[PDB]
Amino acid sequence: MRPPLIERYRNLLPVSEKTPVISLLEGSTPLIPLKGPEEARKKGIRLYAKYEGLNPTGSFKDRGMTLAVSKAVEGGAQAVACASTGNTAASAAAYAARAGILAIVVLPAGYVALGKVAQSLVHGARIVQVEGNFDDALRLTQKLTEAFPVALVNSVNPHRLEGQKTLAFEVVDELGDAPHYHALPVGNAGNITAHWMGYKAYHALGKAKRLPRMLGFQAAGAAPLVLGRPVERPETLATAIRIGNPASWQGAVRAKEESGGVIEAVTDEEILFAYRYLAREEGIFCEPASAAAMAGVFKLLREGRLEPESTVVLTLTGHGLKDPATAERVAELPPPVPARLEAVAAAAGLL
């Protein structure tokens, strides 16, 4: 039912009958139609959540990583490396283990979500925590791949974006056309770039009449693409996108311009509100960075910038399980009570 992504889109990918397919059966994730928000519903605006949290490692990074490691192995690579806020690393770690090769991940000290650390650890990856942020780990890791015979699997590797563009193909395959708008978070910018590549590709093939407007959102304390210049000290509780100098900078600007979309900023508070809304009202638990997409939609809706009767697809990038710690910021765990029908019923608000 959920075939190797490489196999599903073999026709549109730079692969051949000799490409070793290293796959954990990624992609083909649910496109969940949302109930609200109330604002959008009484405006005929329909929202769909492309839940990338259901990929093998819990994020969309598996999409780009399956093609990257597959091609790397095709080249005889026996190790890969990458800088990461957490998810790309977890993906490299898992696929390396799958391929039977070595994985080296460089993370920003103290700025990687507990779940993501747990993954690299258990998958037996070679972890290097550096005293710097993501942008520092990215530059460091690029050299690391030039000092040792290790394949770089960061978005700079063309295969990453080639694989990630498959998400747009899946959205069109399921809806029958491209949506009026597609919202997503923007970190190092590889994803928004890949999305746009996918939509233009299906459009040129005549599988999508319309080209959607790409709506990219960044945390206010790490919005380089929104200010128009790098952010040396990016900050945000949504650590997945605590990036101040996106590698695919031009890719995103181009995607924005060509699609007629935008790349704006949402505050950490708005992120947490959207974060809570999705889990509590829609039953969809994504990580804070992913919630930035919904927070961006709330923003545009609030400003009356979304046309009535339009379709909005949001790429919810990572599963909520990736960042357990943040759950404590939108709800508190009640203290224990005696194991008695009376005590429980009272604590349950039934008495």
Ligand X SMILES: Cc1ncc(COP(=O)(O)O)c(/C=C/C(=O)C(=O)O)c1O
By CB under 6 A, name the binding residues for ligand X.
Answer: 59, 84-88, 185-192, 240-241, 287, 289-290, 317-318
Beta carbon nearer to a second copy, 142 or 259:
142
Which lies closer to ligand X via its Cβ, residue 51 or residue 277? 51
Residue choice 71, 195, 242, 319 for contact with a second copy (CB under 8 A): 319
User: Among residues 95 and 217, whose Cβ is nearest to a second copy?
Assistant: 95
Joined tokens for residue 199: 């939509």
CB of 71 vs ligand X, minimal distance in Å:
18
What count of other Cβ atoms lies within 10 Å of the Cβ of residue 86?
Answer: 29
Contacts with 60 (C-beta within 8 Å, 6 or more apart), sequence order: 52, 164, 167, 191, 315, 317, 318
Is the CB of 45 or the CB of 92 nearer to ligand X?
92
Binding mask 271-310 for a second copy (x = CB under 8 A): ----xx--xxxxxxx-------------------------
Backbone angles phi, psi at 78, to 5 degrees: -125, 20
Nearer to ligand X, 6 or 252 (CB): 252
The CA distance from 81 to 145, in Å, is 7
Distance in angstroms (rounded) separating the CA atoms of residues 328 and 27: 30
User: Binds 24, which of ligand X, a second copy, none (CB < 5 to 8 A, cut-off by type)?
Assistant: a second copy
Q: Name residues contacting a second copy, limited to 54-83 (CB under 8 A).
A: 54-58, 81
Residue 61: CB minimum distance to ligand X, A: 6
Stretch that binds a second copy, among 213-221, 245-253, 308-316, 335-343 (CB under 8 A): 335-343
Please identify, using beta-carbon distances, which residue of 68 and 144 lies nearer to a second copy.
Answer: 144
Chain centre distance of CA 62: 10
Backbone CA torsion sign across 82, 267, 32, 47: negative
Q: Is there binding between residue 147 and a second copy (CB under 8 A)? A: yes
When asked if residue 261 is in the footprint of a second copy (CB under 8 A), the reply is: no
CA atoms of 251 and 89, how far apart (whole Å): 22
**Does the annotation place 11 within a ligand binding site?**
no
* Residue 87, annotated as binding a ligand: yes
Say which residues have a Cβ less than 8 Å from residue 281's Cβ, sequence separation at least 6. Answer: 35, 36, 37
Contact residues for 214 (Cβ-Cβ < 8 A; gap 6+): 181, 182, 184, 192, 195, 196, 255, 256, 259, 261
Q: Is 317 in the site for a second copy (CB under 8 A)?
A: no
Residues placed in the known binding site for pyridoxal 5'-phosphate = 87, 187-191, 317
